[PDB]
Amino acid sequence: QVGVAGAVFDESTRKILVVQDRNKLKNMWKFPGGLSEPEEDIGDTAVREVFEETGIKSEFRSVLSIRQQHDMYIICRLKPYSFTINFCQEECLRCEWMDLNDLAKTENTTPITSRVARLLLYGYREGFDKIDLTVEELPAVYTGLFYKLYHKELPENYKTM
Amino acid sequence: QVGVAGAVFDESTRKILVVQDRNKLKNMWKFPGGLSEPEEDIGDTAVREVFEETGIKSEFRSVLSIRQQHDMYIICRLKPYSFTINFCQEECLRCEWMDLNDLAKTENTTPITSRVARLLLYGYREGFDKIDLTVEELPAVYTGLFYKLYHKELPENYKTM
Numbered sequence: 001q002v003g004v005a006g007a008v009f010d011e012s013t014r015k016i017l018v019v020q021d022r023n024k025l026k027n028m029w030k031f032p033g034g035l036s037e038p039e040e041d042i043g044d045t046a047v048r049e050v051f052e053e054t055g056i057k058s059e060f061r062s063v064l065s066i067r068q069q070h071d072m073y074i075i076c077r078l079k080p081y082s083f084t085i086n087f088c089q090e091e092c093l094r095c096e097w098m099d100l101n102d103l104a105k106t107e108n109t110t111p112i113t114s115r116v117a118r119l120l121l122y123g124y125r126e127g128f129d130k131i132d133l134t135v136e137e138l139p140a141v142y143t144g145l146f147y148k149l150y151h152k153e154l155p156e157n158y159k160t161m
Numbered sequence: 162q163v164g165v166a167g168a169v170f171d172e173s174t175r176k177i178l179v180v181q182d183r184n185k186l187k188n189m190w191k192f193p194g195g196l197s198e199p200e201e202d203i204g205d206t207a208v209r210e211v212f213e214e215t216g217i218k219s220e221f222r223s224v225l226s227i228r229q230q231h232d233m234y235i236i237c238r239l240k241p242y243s244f245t246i247n248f249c250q251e252e253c254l255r256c257e258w259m260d261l262n263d264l265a266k267t268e269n270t271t272p273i274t275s276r277v278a279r280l281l282l283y284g285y286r287e288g289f290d291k292i293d294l295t296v297e298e299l300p301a302v303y304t305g306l307f308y309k310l311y312h313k314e315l316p317e318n319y320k321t322m
Contacts, residue, residue, distance in 0.1 A: 002229070025303055065312040068163070069301075071232050105322055110302045112310060118319045119312055131313045133294070140230075141271045142186055149273060151226040151280055152292045152313065158279045161266055 003073040004045035005033030008058045008080050009120050015097040016120065017056060017080065018113075022093045029098065029109045031075065031116070042135050042148070046076040054095050055086030062132035065116055066150055074150075075116055077123075077132065100124065129153070164234040165206035166194030169219045169241050170281050176258040177281065178217060178241065179274075183254045190259065190270045192236065192277070203296050203309070207237040215256050216247030223293035226277055227311055235311075236277055238284075238293065261285065290314070 008017035018029040032053040036045040043060030050058050058078040067073040087095035103109060104117040123131040134153045137146050169178035179190040193214040197206040204221030211219050219239040228234040248256035264270060265278040284292040295314045298307050 028302060065310055066227050068233055068309040068311070069306060072229055111299045112308065115299060115310060115312070115315070115320070118322065119315055122315060122319045133313070138272045138276060141189060145230060147273065148229040149226055149276060150229070150311075151276070152294070154276070154280055154283060158283045159276070161279065 001036045001038070002042070002045075002071075003033060003035055004042055004049060005031040005073065005075045006046035006050040006058065006078045007031050007064060007075060007116055007120060008050055008054075008056055008078040009100065009124070010080050010083075010097070011124060013097070014100050014124065016100045016103050016117065017050070017054060017085075018096060018098050018103060018109075019053060019087070019092045020094040022089075022091055025110075026093050027108055028113075029103065029106065030113055033073070033075075042074050043076060046074075046078055050078060053088050053091055055082075055084065056080055057082040062128070062153070063135050063150055064119055064131060064133070065112075067112060074135070075112075077120070077128070162197045162199070163203070163206075163232075164194060164196055165203055165210060166192040166234065166236045167207035167211040167219065167239045168192050168225060168236060168277055168281060169211055169215075169217055169239040170261065170285070171241050171244075171258070172285060174258070175261050175285065177261045177264050177278065178211070178215060178246075179257060179259050179264060179270075180214060180248070180253045181255040183250075183252055186271075187254050188269055189274075190264065190267065191274055194234070194236075203235050204237060207235075207239055211239060214249050214252055216243075216245065217241055218243040223289070223314070224296050224311055225280055225292060225294070226273075228273060235296070236273075238281070238289070 034049045062077045065075045195210045219241045223238045226236045
């Protein structure tokens with residue numbers, strides 16, 4: 001099943017919600033995330049994983065990045081609507097609203113997390129339209145399968161011609 | 162191995178290079194594509210698959226879309242620098258420089274191809290910066306693995322802070 005992470009950014013305070021895992025890379029700040037359940041939309045996985053790890057209630061806004069290895073892991077931009085952290089003590093050592101600029105500069109994070117922080121900063125300064133991507137389900141033609149398609153948000157007048 | 166497609170768009174003529182497979186969906190226009198070889202960068206797969214199917218020489222410019230099923234298939238924007246079609250007769254029935262607006266409107270294509278045509282039209286009218294994404298290799302921290310990360314192009318001053 002696909003993994004999904006939530007990058008919960010408060011555009012009013014310039015804060016980004018991050019965690020340190022209790023038992024894995026406990027000194028590296030990361031975004032909360034985990035595995036989708038069967039039938040779960042990507043955005044719902046993000047919002048659920050965030051809430052379970054951090055106590056923060058949020059809304060899906062966009063996809064920010066797709067991570068591919070040898071399979072897929074989707075990192076999403078979320079907008080918080082609660083702000084009191086109640087983190088999962090079995091899973092996390094720390095959970096903070098960190099200054100986004102601090103995450104973008106720290107060495108105590110992963111290269112992917114840092115890249116996604118820098119991308120958030122670019123959207124914070126120059127507009128989220130610069131960075132946001134959508135995910136949509138589209139049908140196959142040759143078979144009865146379905147795909148998920150990730151791309152820059154396409155204005156409604158073009159999606160439909 | 163990942164699949165990769167090439168959407169070869171001539172911004173000077175508003176034409177998009179498309180094929181009909183000789184033996185599969187022979188009435189549906191599609192972008193040339195196929196499987197990456199071991200060690201091959203995504204862009205090189207695109208350029209090679211295009212050349213092998215169509216005779217057209219091109220250069221990678223960006224990623225346009227990521228297609229996910231139950232694994233990954235990357236659709237790239239390419240810029241042609243040769244224009245004489247010499248298609249692979251064993252593989253394709255037709256290969257044409259089609260008007261992009263015609264591809265964006267036709268029923269004789271797939272929903273994904275049509276979506277990517279509409280996204281190209283949006284870039285043709287409003288700038289390719291609106292649609293282009295990059296792919297880069299970034300390292301893991303927990304293990305010795307590497308990932309590929311797909312996201313909107315991030316200006317150099319931010320990538321590096």
